[PDB]
Design an enzyme around this catalytic site. Sequence first.
Site, mmCIF file in Angstrom:
data_model
loop_
_atom_site.group_PDB
_atom_site.id
_atom_site.type_symbol
_atom_site.label_atom_id
_atom_site.label_comp_id
_atom_site.label_asym_id
_atom_site.label_seq_id
_atom_site.Cartn_x
_atom_site.Cartn_y
_atom_site.Cartn_z
ATOM 1 N N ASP A 67 15.061 -2.029 6.610
ATOM 2 C CA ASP A 67 14.054 -1.922 5.511
ATOM 3 C C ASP A 67 13.679 -2.614 4.608
ATOM 4 O OD1 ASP A 67 15.936 -3.251 3.637
ATOM 5 O OD2 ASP A 67 16.165 -1.703 2.112
ATOM 6 N N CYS A 102 16.500 -6.473 4.611
ATOM 7 C CA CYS A 102 18.477 -6.932 5.140
ATOM 8 C C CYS A 102 18.738 -8.240 5.256
ATOM 9 C CB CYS A 102 18.118 -5.998 6.297
ATOM 10 S SG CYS A 102 17.418 -7.080 7.642
ATOM 11 N N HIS A 148 16.149 -7.873 12.762
ATOM 12 C CA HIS A 148 16.906 -7.295 12.201
ATOM 13 C C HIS A 148 17.964 -8.538 11.663
ATOM 14 C CE1 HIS A 148 16.911 -2.473 11.891
ATOM 15 N NE2 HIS A 148 16.239 -2.082 12.653
HETATM 16 C C1 LIG Z 1 15.806 -7.278 7.636
HETATM 17 C C2 LIG Z 1 15.400 -6.455 8.317
HETATM 18 O O1 LIG Z 1 15.203 -5.061 6.740
HETATM 19 N N1 LIG Z 1 14.941 -5.911 8.957
HETATM 20 C C3 LIG Z 1 14.072 -4.886 9.478
HETATM 21 C C4 LIG Z 1 13.230 -4.946 10.644
HETATM 22 C C5 LIG Z 1 13.401 -3.644 10.293
HETATM 23 C C6 LIG Z 1 12.035 -2.701 11.838
HETATM 24 O O2 LIG Z 1 13.017 -2.673 9.898
HETATM 25 N N2 LIG Z 1 13.462 -4.526 8.097
#
Ligand SMILES: *CC(=O)Nc1cc(C)on1
EC number: 3.4.19.12
Length: 225
Positions: free
Chosen positions: A43, A46, A219
């Site tokens: 989101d 992360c 991510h």
């Molecule tokens: C860390 C984080 O929130 N990464 C992320 C990758 C994508 C797709 O959305 N949020």
Amino acid sequence: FNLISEKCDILSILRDHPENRIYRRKIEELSKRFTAIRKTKGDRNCFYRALGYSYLESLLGKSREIFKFKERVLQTPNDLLAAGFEEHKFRNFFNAFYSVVELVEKDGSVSSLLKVFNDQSASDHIVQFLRLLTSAFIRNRADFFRHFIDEEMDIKDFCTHEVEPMATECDHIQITALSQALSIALQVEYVDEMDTALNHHVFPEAATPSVYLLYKTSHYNILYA
Ligand SMILES: *CC(=O)Nc1cc(C)on1
């Protein structure tokens, strides 16, 4: 468990990259060094959410380490004030983070810590606190981030646009600054789709890590050794 998952076997993530030779090779290699993973919701928050949960999880049952961390957390309002944040505007976010630190001391279970970090309200309040602290730490040490990271960068604008707002993605500057701000040692493992060696970076250099993260498809997931 919509924000931070239950633990799974490392090889369970092969299914996220079916028929991909490079991702399969790197995940197999990763499995020789780590036994388990937790997934975090993608989101934009992360990094903060994963570092917060994994570091506090690592403190459970360690009475001296909890006492020393609580002592540092009690002083963080002074970092926010020195960077120009106002107490009545950060109070709600600080109180949510101090609360989960007291949970680690008093309750001390994985199950209770995971419930707070999967509570959208408590968890988002914790993430917003971590983002304000990251911004304060950079602002109060602007010459260090210009000297060592980028002599040409505009520090105040960077913090306003790429640190403070929810859902803004992190780079090395944010990871370095939040590590330093809370004295958290972490190791990030990198898995990209180039035909290269699996590799990692330790923050700060040469520390013994508390936390291991996997950075893959932009991510951050949590690793166990
Ligand atoms: C860390 C984080 O929130 N990464 C992320 C990758 C994508 C797709 O959305 N949020």
